[PDB]
Every structure is written in structure tokens, then in C-alpha cells.
């Protein structure tokens, strides 16, 4: 029953496109790791982080946004395909 200037402010500025807000994990001597939520240290360049002064701007810890990417893993099978066995020129019919 108190909160005389504890709340957010309820405005948004910025728009969706597939962004996630993650923090610095570790910061390489070339490249730079940020977790956004997962297992795997989402790998990023420092040179997306740091500005085109050529100097990164953040630093291990410091609360970065990295850019959701789109991609599985498939480990690949086997496909009964034309493209896969060699054959001349032919086909194939039904109901003869």
C-alpha cells in the first residue's frame, strides 16, 4: 500500500522487429558474447557494439540489445530424390 514514485513509465518509443534486450557475458579480445536468454552465448562482433569512432561503447556487464536471429539446427537425413541418384533421361508411370 505505497508507491509514491515507484512506477515505470507506461509510453513506448521504440517499435517491434524481432529484437531481444541480453546483457554482456564476456567480452573477447576481437569479438564480443551476450546472453539473450538462452544456453548458448549469443555470438556478436565488437564492432556492432562499439560506435564508428572504432571504440566499443559497452563493456562486460553492461546491458546490451541483440539483434533475435532466425535459424535451427538440422542435423540432415536421407531423402529419396531424382537429384540424389544419378539416372538418364526417364520417368516413371502408375495405373498402367
Known sequence: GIDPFTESLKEIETRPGSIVRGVV??????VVLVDAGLKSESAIPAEQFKNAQGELEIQVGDEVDVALDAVEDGFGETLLSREKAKRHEAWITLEK
Open 25 to 30: 557475458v564476456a567480452i573477447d579480445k576481437d
